[PDB]
Amino acid sequence: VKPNYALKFTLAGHTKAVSSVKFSPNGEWLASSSADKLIKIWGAYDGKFEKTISGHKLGISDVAWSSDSNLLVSASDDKTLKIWDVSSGKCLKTLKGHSNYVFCCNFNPQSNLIVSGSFDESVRIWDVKTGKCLKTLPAHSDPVSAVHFNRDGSLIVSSSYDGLCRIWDTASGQCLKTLIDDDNPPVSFVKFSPNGKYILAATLDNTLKLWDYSKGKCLKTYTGHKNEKYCIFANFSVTGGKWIVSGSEDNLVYIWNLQTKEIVQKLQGHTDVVISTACHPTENIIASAALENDKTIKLWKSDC
């Protein structure tokens, strides 16, 4: 069995590289962040431009949604994160504390917390309600490329160009686990599987790996694409067949069969590196976003 993703819409508007796209948990929206300092909101089904959200003084590397789809948090080169009320487009809180570019961000499932990773090599945990930084974790020895909470918010996984994936106890701040194969290529992306039992990790040697968290071993390996330079988002696609989805530096979206590790689709259309992909929470819809020579977001839809 294979998916049949086909291009449906191209979302144009950003004036610089698009850095990250994410679907709202309610499925209504796509948020995109860009080097142009802006967040844009688009209809998830029709691709229709909804609104521009502005405020950051420099470009943005990541955006993420609260579980109730009412808030966004963005991570910027201006050293801040901002929490945004989506409906009004207003900045509710500016999270200050990082001493270098903020690179990645995510809410926990309860959405009372935000986790951030920075070029300052730390991971921070923020109280959404007060905007106060609860913990500064001395997580890594190189920029932090990704941060993600598990199912129940009890754990945070982080990755870094230092070659490490680390798993943190949210409540205590303790490092519970360090994952690494018999080598140290930079880890460019990490996230928990939807059931929280696995971790998908990208490394800058053209490879994605599925790790069993509890056992601490690599189970599956996905290859064939190009990823040597950029921190490209990857995904578990679950609304239809069970796929792994990633961007690639050859301007394609790659889709693998999770179980068999075979490439099942390569989506062509972008004209620069596909830095970000996202999967719709209920429908078979993939959003992809590309760097500066392209500037577009594409929505792709499939029957499985």
Partner: peptide, 12 residues
């Protein structure tokens, strides 16, 4: 100051 506007848009 990142030439391409954002850290994720640069090589490291």
């Amino acid at each position: 100051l990142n030439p391409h506007g954002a850290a994720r848009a640069e090589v490291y």
